[PDB]
Design goal:
Number of domains: 1
Shape: globular
Subunit structure: Homodimer. Interacts with YfiR.
Protein name: Diguanylate cyclase TpbB
Number of helices: 6
Radius of gyration: 16 Å
Number of strands: 7
Strand order of the largest sheet: 2-3-1-6-7
Organism: Pseudomonas aeruginosa (strain ATCC 15692 / DSM 22644 / CIP 104116 / JCM 14847 / LMG 12228 / 1C / PRS 101 / PAO1)
Function: Catalyzes the synthesis of cyclic-di-GMP (c-di-GMP) via the condensation of 2 GTP molecules.
Bound molecules: magnesium ion
Structural class: alpha+beta
Largest sheet: 5 strands, mixed
Subcellular location: Cell inner membrane
Helix content: 40-55%
Length: 172
């Protein structure tokens, strides 16, 4: 199924694909990346400007994310302003960073609202590499999830790689 707003698959889909892609990427001794994406200032937008505005921003974000992928990559909508992105196959971690950087830069452009006004926001992106960080869907997902949290907390609108001491940084 694909959500009616943005036409994007849901987590259930995303996990299976990631599973299949992980089994695959293991076999050919190759790399893949998971990106966890959360919009910045979302609640503020809906409060100050209302559902319709929010939805518009979601649709835009969705369009801009897919704008930066290759036919082989996958965007799912987790829920809310939050999306999951599968980057397979991958030449290098560098590549993942670079794509993230482009998704981030994509947001420098303002978003046209239904009344012709304009909002600017950011995304925050946590990135988790295979096989450097984890080797199971659940784990990889979790790691990206956490990296994103840490990123929102450290500086909004940025991308951050999962580190191995991430649970210690979460604890402190
Ligand atoms: Mg948000």
């Amino acid at each position: 199924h694909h959500d009616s707003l943005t036409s994007l698959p849901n987590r259930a889909f995303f996990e299976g694909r990631l599973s299949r892609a992980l089994r695959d990427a293991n076999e050919h001794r190759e790399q893949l990346a998971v990106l966890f994406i959360d919009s910045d200032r979302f609640k503020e937008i809906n409060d100050r400007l209302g559902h319709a505005a929010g939805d518009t921003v979601l649709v835009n974000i969705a369009m801009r994310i897919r704008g930066q992928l290759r036919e082989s990559d996958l965007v799912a909508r987790l829920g809310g302003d939050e999306f999951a992105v599968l980057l397979a196959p991958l030449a290098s971690g560098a590549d993942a960073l670079r794509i993230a950087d482009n998704i981030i830069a994509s947001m420098q452009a303002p978003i046209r609202l239904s009344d012709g006004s304009t909002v600017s926001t950011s995304l925050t992106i946590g990135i988790a590499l295979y096989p450097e960080h984890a080797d199971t869907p659940a784990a990889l997902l979790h790691d990206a999830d956490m990296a994103m949290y840490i990123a929102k907390r450290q500086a909004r609108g940025s991308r951050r790689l999962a580190e191995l001491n991430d649970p210690r940084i979460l604890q402190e």
